[PDB]
């Protein structure tokens, strides 16, 4: 059980082919018409985990 939860929380540092692994940096740097593409990559990657 410890291994499963340890690996789940370490998946948040991956990028899944995006600009950065933090939502705030993406939102504060890119415009909404374009930043929605970058966020879509994190959502699909984190939903799989």
């Amino acid at each position: 059980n410890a291994q499963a939860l340890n690996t789940l929380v370490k998946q948040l540092s991956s990028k899944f082919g995006a600009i950065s692994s933090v939502l705030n940096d993406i939102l504060s740097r890119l415009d909404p018409p374009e930043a929605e593409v970058q966020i879509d990559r994190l959502i699909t990657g984190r939903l799989q985990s």
């Binding site: 950065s20 705030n24 940096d25 504060s28």
Partner: protein
């Protein structure tokens, strides 16, 4: 064609931009903008020997 190449997410520099500054608040749930770092939390002094 002037190219204004730059990097990000490194040691902070003087070149930031035209924004103001405020005082400090502690032990309160407050958003922070410590030179790009955006988020919320509670700020407390400790003994982390940097």
């Amino acid at each position: 064609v002037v190219v204004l190449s730059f990097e990000l997410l490194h040691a902070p520099a003087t070149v930031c931009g035209p924004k103001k500054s405020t005082n400090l608040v502690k032990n309160k749930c407050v958003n922070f903008n410590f030179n790009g770092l955006t988020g919320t939390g509670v700020l407390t002094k400790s003994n982390k020997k940097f």
